[PDB]
Structure formats: C-alpha cells, structure tokens
PDB file of C-alpha atoms and ligand atoms in Angstrom:
ATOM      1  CA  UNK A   8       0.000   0.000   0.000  1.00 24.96           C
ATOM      2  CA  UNK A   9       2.773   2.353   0.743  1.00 25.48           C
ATOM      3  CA  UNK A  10       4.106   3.308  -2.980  1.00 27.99           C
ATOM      4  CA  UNK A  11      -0.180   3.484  -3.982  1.00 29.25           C
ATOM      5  CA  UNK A  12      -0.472   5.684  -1.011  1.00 32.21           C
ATOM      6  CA  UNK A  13       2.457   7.832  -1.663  1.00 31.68           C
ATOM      7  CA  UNK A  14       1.329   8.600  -5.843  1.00 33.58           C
ATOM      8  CA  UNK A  15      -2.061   9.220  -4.619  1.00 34.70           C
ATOM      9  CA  UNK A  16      -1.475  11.876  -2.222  1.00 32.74           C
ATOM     10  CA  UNK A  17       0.942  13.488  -5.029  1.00 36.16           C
ATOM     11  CA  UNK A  18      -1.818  13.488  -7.223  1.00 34.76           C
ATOM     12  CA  UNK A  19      -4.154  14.591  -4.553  1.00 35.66           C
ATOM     13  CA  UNK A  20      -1.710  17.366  -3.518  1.00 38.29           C
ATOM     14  CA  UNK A  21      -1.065  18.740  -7.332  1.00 41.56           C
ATOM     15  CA  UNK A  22      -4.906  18.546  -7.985  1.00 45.24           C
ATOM     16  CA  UNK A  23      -5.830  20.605  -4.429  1.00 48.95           C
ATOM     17  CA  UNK A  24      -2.343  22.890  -5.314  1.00 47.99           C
ATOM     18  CA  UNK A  25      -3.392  23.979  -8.437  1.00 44.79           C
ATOM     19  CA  UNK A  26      -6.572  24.509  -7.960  1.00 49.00           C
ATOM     20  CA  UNK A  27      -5.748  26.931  -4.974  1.00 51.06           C
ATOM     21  CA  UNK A  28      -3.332  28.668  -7.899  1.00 52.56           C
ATOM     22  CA  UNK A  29      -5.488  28.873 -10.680  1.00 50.72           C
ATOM     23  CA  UNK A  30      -8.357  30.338  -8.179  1.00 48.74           C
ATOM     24  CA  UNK A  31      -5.822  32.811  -7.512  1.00 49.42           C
ATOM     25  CA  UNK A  32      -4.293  33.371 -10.826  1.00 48.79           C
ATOM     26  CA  UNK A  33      -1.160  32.338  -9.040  1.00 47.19           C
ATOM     27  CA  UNK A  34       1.618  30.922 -11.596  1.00 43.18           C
ATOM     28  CA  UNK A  35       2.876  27.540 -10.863  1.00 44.34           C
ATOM     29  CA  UNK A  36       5.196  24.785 -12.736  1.00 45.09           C
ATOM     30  CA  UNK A  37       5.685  21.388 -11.739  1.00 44.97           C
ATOM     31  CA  UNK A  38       7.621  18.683 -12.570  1.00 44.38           C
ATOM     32  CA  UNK A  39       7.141  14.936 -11.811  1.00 44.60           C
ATOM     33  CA  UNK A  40      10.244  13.073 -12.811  1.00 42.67           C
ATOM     34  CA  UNK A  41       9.962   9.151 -13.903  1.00 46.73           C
ATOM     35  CA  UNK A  42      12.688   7.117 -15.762  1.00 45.53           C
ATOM     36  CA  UNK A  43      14.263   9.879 -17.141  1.00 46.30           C
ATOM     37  CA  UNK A  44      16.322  11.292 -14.294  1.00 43.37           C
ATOM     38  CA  UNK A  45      16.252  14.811 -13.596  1.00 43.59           C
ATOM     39  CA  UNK A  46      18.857  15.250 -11.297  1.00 44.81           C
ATOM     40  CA  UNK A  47      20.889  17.423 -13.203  1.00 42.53           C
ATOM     41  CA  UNK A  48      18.075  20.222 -12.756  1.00 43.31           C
ATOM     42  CA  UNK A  49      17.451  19.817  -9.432  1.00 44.22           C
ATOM     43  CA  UNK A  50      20.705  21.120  -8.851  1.00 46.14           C
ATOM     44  CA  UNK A  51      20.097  23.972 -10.162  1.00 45.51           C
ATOM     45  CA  UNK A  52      17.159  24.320  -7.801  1.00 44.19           C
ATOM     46  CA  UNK A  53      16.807  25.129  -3.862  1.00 42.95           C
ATOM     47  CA  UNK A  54      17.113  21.938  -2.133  1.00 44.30           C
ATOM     48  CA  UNK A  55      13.996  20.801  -0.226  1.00 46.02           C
ATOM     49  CA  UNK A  56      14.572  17.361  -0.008  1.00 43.62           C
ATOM     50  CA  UNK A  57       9.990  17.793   1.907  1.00 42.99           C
ATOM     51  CA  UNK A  58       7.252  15.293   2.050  1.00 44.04           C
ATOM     52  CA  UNK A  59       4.597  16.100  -0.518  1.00 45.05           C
ATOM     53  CA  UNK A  60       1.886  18.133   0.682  1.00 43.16           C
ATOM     54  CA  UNK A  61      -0.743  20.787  -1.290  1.00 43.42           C
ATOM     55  CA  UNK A  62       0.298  23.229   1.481  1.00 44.43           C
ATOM     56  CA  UNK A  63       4.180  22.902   0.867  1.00 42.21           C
ATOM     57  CA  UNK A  64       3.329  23.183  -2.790  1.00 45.50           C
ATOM     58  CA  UNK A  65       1.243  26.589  -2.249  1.00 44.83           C
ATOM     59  CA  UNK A  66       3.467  28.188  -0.113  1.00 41.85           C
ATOM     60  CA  UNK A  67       6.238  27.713  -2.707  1.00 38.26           C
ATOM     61  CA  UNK A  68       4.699  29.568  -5.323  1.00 38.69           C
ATOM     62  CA  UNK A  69       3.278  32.645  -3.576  1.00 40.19           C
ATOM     63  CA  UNK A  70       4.451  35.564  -5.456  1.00 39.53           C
ATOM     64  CA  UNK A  71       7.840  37.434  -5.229  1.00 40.01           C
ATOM     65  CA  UNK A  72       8.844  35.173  -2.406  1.00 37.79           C
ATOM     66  CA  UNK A  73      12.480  33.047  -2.279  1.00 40.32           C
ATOM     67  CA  UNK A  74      11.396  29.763  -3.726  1.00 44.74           C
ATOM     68  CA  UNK A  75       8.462  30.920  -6.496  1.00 43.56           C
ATOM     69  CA  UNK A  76      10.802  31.813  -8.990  1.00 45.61           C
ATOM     70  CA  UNK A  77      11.319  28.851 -11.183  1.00 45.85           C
ATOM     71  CA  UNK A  78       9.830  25.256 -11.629  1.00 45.92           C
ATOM     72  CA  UNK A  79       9.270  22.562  -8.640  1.00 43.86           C
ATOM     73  CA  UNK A  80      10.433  19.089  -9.444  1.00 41.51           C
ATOM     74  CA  UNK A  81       8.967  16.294  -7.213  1.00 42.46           C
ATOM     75  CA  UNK A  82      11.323  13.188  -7.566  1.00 44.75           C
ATOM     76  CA  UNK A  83      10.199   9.748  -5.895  1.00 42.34           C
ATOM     77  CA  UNK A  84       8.074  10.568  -2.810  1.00 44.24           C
ATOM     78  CA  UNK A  85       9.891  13.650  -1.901  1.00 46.73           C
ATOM     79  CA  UNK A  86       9.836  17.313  -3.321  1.00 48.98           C
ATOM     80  CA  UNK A  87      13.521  17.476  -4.128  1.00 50.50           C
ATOM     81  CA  UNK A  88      14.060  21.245  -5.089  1.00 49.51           C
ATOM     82  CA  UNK A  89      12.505  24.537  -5.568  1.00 50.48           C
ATOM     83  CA  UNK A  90      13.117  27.491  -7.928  1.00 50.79           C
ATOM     84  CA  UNK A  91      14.651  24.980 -10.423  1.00 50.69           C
ATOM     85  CA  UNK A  92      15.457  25.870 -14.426  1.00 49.90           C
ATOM     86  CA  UNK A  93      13.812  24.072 -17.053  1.00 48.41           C
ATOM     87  CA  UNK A  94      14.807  24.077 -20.847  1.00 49.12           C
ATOM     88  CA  UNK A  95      13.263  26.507 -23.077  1.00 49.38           C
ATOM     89  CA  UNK A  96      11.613  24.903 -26.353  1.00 50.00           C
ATOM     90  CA  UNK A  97      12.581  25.712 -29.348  1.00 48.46           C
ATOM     91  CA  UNK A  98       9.083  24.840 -31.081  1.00 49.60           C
ATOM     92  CA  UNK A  99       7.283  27.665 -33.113  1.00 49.63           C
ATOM     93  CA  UNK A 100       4.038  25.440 -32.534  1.00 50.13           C
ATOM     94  CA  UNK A 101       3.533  26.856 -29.304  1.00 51.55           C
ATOM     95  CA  UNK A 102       1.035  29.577 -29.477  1.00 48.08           C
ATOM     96  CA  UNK A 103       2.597  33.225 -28.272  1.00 43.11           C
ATOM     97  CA  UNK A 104      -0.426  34.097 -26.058  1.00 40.40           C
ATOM     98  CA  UNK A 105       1.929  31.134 -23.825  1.00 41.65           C
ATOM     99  CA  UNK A 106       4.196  32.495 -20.987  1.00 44.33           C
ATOM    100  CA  UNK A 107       7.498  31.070 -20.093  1.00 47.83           C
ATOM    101  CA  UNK A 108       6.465  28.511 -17.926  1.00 48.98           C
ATOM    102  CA  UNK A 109       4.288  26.720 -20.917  1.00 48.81           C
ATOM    103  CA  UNK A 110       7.462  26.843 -22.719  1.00 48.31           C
ATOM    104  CA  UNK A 111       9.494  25.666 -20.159  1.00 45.55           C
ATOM    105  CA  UNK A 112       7.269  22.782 -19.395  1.00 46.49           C
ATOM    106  CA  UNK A 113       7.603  21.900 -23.258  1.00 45.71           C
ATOM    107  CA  UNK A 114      11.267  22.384 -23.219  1.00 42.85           C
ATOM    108  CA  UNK A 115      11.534  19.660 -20.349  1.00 42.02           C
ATOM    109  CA  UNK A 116       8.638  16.863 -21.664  1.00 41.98           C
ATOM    110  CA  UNK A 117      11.079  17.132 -24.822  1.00 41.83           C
ATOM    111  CA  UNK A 118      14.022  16.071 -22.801  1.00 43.44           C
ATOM    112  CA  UNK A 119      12.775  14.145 -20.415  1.00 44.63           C
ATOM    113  CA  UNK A 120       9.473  11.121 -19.712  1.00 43.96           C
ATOM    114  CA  UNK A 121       8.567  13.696 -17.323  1.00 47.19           C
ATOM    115  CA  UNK A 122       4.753  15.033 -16.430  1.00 46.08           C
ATOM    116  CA  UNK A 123       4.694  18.717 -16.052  1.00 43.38           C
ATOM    117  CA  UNK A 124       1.522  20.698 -15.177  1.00 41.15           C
ATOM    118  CA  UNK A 125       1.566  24.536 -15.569  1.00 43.02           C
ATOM    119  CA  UNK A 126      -0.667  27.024 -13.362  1.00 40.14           C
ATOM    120  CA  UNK A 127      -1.367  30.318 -15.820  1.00 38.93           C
ATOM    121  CA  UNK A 128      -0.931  33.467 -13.904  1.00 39.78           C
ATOM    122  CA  UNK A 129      -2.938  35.442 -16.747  1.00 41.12           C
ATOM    123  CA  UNK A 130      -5.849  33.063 -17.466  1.00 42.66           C
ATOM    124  CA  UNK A 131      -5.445  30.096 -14.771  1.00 45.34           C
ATOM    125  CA  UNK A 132      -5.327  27.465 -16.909  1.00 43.75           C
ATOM    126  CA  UNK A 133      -3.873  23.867 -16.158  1.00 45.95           C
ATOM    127  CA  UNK A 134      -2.094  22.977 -18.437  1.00 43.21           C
ATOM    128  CA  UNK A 135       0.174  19.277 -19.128  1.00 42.72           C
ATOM    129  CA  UNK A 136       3.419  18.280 -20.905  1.00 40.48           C
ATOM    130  CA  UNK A 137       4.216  15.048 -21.573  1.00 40.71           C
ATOM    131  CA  UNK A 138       6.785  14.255 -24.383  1.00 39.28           C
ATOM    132  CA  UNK A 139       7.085  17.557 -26.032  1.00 39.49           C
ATOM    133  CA  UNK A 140       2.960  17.881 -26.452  1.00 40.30           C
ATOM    134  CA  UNK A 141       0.441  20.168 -24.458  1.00 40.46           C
ATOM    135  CA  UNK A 142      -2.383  19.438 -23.373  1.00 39.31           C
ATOM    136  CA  UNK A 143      -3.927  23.519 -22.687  1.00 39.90           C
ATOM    137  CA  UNK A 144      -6.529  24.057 -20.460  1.00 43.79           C
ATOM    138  CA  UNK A 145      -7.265  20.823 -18.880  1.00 42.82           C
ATOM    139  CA  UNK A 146     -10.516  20.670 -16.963  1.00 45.11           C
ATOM    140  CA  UNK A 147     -10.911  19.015 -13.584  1.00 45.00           C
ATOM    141  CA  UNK A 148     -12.197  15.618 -14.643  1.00 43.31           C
ATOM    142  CA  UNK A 149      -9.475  15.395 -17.439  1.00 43.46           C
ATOM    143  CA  UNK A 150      -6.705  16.433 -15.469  1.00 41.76           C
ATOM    144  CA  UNK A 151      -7.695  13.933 -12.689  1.00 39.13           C
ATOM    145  CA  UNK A 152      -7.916  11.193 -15.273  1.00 39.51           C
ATOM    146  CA  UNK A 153      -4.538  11.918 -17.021  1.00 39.70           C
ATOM    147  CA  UNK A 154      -2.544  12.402 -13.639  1.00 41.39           C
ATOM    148  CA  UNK A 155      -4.674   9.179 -12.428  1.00 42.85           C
ATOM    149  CA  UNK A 156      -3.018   7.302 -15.461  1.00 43.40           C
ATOM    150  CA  UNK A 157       0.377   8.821 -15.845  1.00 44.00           C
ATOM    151  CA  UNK A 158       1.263   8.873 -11.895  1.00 42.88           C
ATOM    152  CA  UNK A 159      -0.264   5.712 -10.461  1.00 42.35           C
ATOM    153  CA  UNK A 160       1.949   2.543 -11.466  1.00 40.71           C
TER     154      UNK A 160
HETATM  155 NA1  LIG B 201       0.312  27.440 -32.125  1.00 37.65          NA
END
C-alpha cells in the first residue's frame, strides 16, 4: 500500500495545489520526474529534499517570495528542489499568447518522460506536458484522469 499511497497523495496534492493557484491566478510549474532522471536540474534548484503536501506546494509559489521563482520538481516521494530551471523549447508550434512557464514545461517533456503541469498566472489554466505535447486548459475531470493514469503505477 505504501508506494499506492504515496502517488495518490501526489496526485491529490497537485490537484488541491493547483486549484488553490489557478483560483488565484497564481503561476505555478511542476515537474514529476519518472525514468528519465532529472537530477541534473534539481541542482540547479533550492534543495527541499519535503514530504509532498498541497500546502508545501502553495506556499512555494506565492508571489515574489524566495522559492516561487522557477519550476518545482517532485522526484520519488519527496519534493527534491525549488526554484529549479527548465529548458526553453525551441518549437514555433507553441502559441505566443503562452508564458514562459508553458514553454518551459515543453522544453523539459522534450528532454525528459517527465509530467509537467503549468498554473497560468494570466488566465489560470492547467495545463500538461508530456513528451514535447500540451495538453492547454485541462478541466478538472481530465486532469484527474490523465494524472490518475500517468502517476499511479
Ligand atoms: Na500554435
């Protein structure tokens, strides 16, 4: 029960996360790392090294505070780092109305297996990457079905 329990509350604690953000127009990017190891950008993060928890995850990306700026990676059953770079994309598919987080959750899913979701600051959209495609505007019941299917082993 313990690795069920564990990917459960992490989708339970992105689902309640985000939808605190996007209520909020709060921007938000986070990345779930699988096979693909992500290591090398969670060094360039803030070390955390935390249990996974909605509130953990809000508090991080409250505006113009020390750990906001930048993506979250969740690795395992911990939140490794904070404030961590992803890789631009270089695609001209993206549409421009896109900030720098949709971009930077592209440039990652490219990269990496990894499953990114993306809190909009302007509209409050959730949106996924998941090997360089976007999935824009995901509603409740679709984003609970995808992480439901991606996360859950
Ligand atoms: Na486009």
């Amino acid at each position: 029960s313990r690795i069920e329990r564990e990917q459960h509350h992490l989708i339970e604690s992105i689902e309640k996360s985000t939808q605190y953000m996007a209520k909020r127009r709060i921007g938000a990017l986070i990345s779930v790392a699988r096979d693909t190891g992500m290591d090398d950008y969670i060094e360039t993060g803030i070390p955390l090294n935390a249990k996974i928890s909605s509130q953990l995850l809000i508090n991080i990306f409250i505006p113009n505070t020390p750990l906001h700026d930048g993506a979250v990676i969740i690795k395992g059953n911990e939140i490794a780092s904070a404030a961590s770079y992803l890789p631009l994309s270089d695609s001209p598919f993206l549409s421009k109305e896109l900030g720098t987080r949709h971009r930077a959750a592209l440039g990652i899913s490219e990269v990496t297996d990894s499953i990114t979701i993306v809190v909009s600051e302007e509209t409050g959209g959730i949106s996924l990457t998941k090997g360089g495609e976007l999935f824009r505007d995901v509603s409740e019941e679709e984003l609970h079905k995808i992480l439901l299917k991606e996360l859950v082993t």
